[PDB]
Design a protein around this ligand. Structure first.
Ligand SMILES: [Zn+2]
Ligand SMILES: [Zn+2]
Ligand SMILES: [Zn+2]
Ligand SMILES: [Zn+2]
Lengths: 65, 65
């Protein structure tokens, strides 16, 4: 037996955060009131623009739907 | 880059084939006119009852939605 997972590479898009949000890579605040970072459209990971190139491309999540 | 795949184990359910259909494992006809075998609800693999025991559990398909 195994979980069903969606497995691919991240699909980051510039995101406008409405609440103070931290970088899931480095832990620092996503500064600004708009376009503060990128959110993966698939798994929800949030990263600074500068951290996009520091994260592994692997993007997985468990599918419950 | 990479494709995105849905990955898990097969989820077979007895299926009523409306046209002559073959076992995706062994190649022999799924005999009869109803409940001839099982179809994986995730990837569509068709198997005889007896072949359910023989196939690898791995179930993957490319997501195009
Ligand atoms: Zn992702
Ligand atoms: Zn960061
Ligand atoms: Zn399957
Ligand atoms: Zn068979």
């Amino acid at each position: 037996g195994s979980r069903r997972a969606s497995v691919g590479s991240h699909r980051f898009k510039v995101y406008n955060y409405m609440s103070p949000t931290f970088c899931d890579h480095c832990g620092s605040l996503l500064w600004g009131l708009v376009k503060q970072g990128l959110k993966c459209e698939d798994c929800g990971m949030n990263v600074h623009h500068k951290c996009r190139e520091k994260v592994a491309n692997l993007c997985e999540f468990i599918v419950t739907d």
